């Protein structure tokens, strides 16, 4: 049962999420994310640090990136 979609500007960058199991984009570039058995999430730029939701993983990625473009 998938999380809801989201779309917002976070620290100046557009973050979007949508069910697909779930896709996240940072300024239109896909951010790979993964769901853990307990329902938390990680992303490929925070792969050892569970956060509760795909939006939390998108925000953590924007924090980690410090303005840098994501690579596809």
Partner 1 sequence: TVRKNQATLTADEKRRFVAAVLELKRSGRYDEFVRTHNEFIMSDTDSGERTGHRSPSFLPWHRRFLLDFEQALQSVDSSVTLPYWDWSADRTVRASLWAPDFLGGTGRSTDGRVMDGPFAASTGNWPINVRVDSRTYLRRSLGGSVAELPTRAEVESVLAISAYDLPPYNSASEGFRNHLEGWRGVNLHNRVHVWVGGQMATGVSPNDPVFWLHHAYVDKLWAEWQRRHPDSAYVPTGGTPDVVDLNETMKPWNTVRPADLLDHTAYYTFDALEHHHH
Beta bridge partner(s), residue 42 = 34
Task: Return the number of the residue (18 or 60) whose C-beta is nearest partner 1.
Answer: 60
Of 2-10, 12-20, 30-38, 51-59, the segment contacting partner 1 by CB under 8 A is 30-38
Binding partner 1 (rule: CB under 8 A), the pick from 47, 52, 54, 56 is 47
Question: Rg of the Cα trace of the chain?
Answer: 11
Closest contact distance (angstroms) between CB of 67 and partner 1 is 9
Report whether 54 contacts 24 (CB < 8 A): yes
Residue 52 — φ and ψ, nearest 5°? -70, -25
- 35 lines the binding site for partner 1 (CB under 8 A): yes
């Amino acid at each position: 049962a998938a999380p809801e979609s989201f779309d917002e500007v976070y620290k100046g960058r557009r973050i979007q999420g949508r069910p697909a199991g779930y896709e996240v984009f940072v300024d239109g570039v896909q951010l790979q994310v993964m769901r853990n058995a307990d329902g938390s999430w990680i992303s490929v730029v925070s792969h050892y640090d569970p956060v509760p939701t795909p939006r939390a993983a998108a925000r953590a990625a924007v924090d980690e990136l410090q303005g840098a473009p994501l690579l596809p």
